[PDB]
């Protein structure tokens, strides 16, 4: 399989390690790991365009969107490539992440390697919020932690 | 063109921002930026195989070496793809990095996106140190700071 990894860090207590695996060319990508330091409940979770952390997570730019689509949820046909929905933190502030996605890839034009994974302050409304930002950012708010997605062994 | 960036961090603080630019896929990569917190003199400087910072810079693995060649300096034919030689810190501990390299790339199979840039404790002996480690690591010693190479705007 092709593999990737990301260490999430930010200005506050949110930190984690997320793994990626793609067993087959153009096959599903498994995304799994843990993030701690979160408020209980849903937090938006996306791949952003740039693997630039020079001024922290803001430097990563907008969601990764090579097809020029509107923001959506991962189950939607209308979504950005980087739209991975929400992760859910428990009462202790820990999110056990376990996602399978076939829109992201670890090779080719939808490759996420060298881009930034971000976990947000608020839940992502998946493009269903009824204001104009919903179909751009999902109203997920501030960026709590992020890291560049790297090739793994 | 075509751009990448890397934020180097380690204890000291040893820290820096390194930029990469490649005008065309058949052209060289310019590598430039600044690193502070270093001891005066030469420090080894390489791209390592994995963009994995899970346990700090050790997790990046060996030098990026897809052709399975011996370690060398950047001018040599027999070198690892990731072998960028040394950077030089002044009396204030600052290295102004300015490299052009024709063996690394920002696309294709020598692509360094998603890999780790590392600056070392010791100078790299460029494979001419006369012990067996010389033609593996250049005897550059510990890893002072590193970061994953990300796609830049
Ligand atoms: Cu996001
Ligand atoms: Cu090195
Ligand atoms: Na969802
Ligand atoms: Na040299
Ligand atoms: Zn989006
Ligand atoms: Zn080497």
From Swiss-Prot, chains A, B:
Changing residue 83 to A: Loss of zinc binding and enhanced tendency to form aggregates. Changing residue 146 to A: Exhibits very slow copper acquisition. There is a cross-link at residue 32 (1-(tryptophan-3-yl)-tryptophan (Trp-Trp) (interchain with W-33)). It is an enzyme of class 1 (oxidoreductase). Cu cation binds at residues 46, 48, 63, 120. Transmembrane segments: none annotated. The modification Phosphoserine is found at residues 98, 102, 105, 107. It is found in: Cytoplasm; Nucleus. Keywords: Acetylation, Amyotrophic lateral sclerosis, Antioxidant, Copper, Cytoplasm, Disease variant, Disulfide bond, Lipoprotein, Metal-binding, Neurodegeneration, Nucleus, Oxidoreductase, Palmitate, Phosphoprotein, Ubl conjugation, Zinc. One of its GO terms (biological process) is hydrogen peroxide biosynthetic process. Changing residue 80 to A: Loss of zinc binding and enhanced tendency to form aggregates. Changing residue 133 to Q: Abolishes dimerization. Changing residue 45 to C: In ALS1; slow progression. Changing residue 134 to N: In ALS1; reduced metal binding; increases tendency to form fibrillar aggregates. Destroys radicals which are normally produced within the cells and which are toxic to biological systems. It is linked to Amyotrophic lateral sclerosis 1: A neurodegenerative disorder affecting upper motor neurons in the brain and lower motor neurons in the brain stem and spinal cord, resulting in fatal paralysis. Sensory abnormalities are absent. The pathologic hallmarks of the disease include pallor of the corticospinal tract due to loss of motor neurons, presence of ubiquitin-positive inclusions within surviving motor neurons, and deposition of pathologic aggregates. The etiology of amyotrophic lateral sclerosis is likely to be multifactorial, involving both genetic and environmental factors. Spastic tetraplegia and axial hypotonia, progressive: An autosomal recessive, neurologic disorder characterized by loss of motor abilities in the first year of life, after which severe, progressive spastic tetraparesis develops. Affected individuals have severe axial hypotonia, hyperekplexia, hypertonia, and myokymia, reflecting upper motor neuron involvement. Cognitive development may be affected. This is Superoxide dismutase [Cu-Zn].
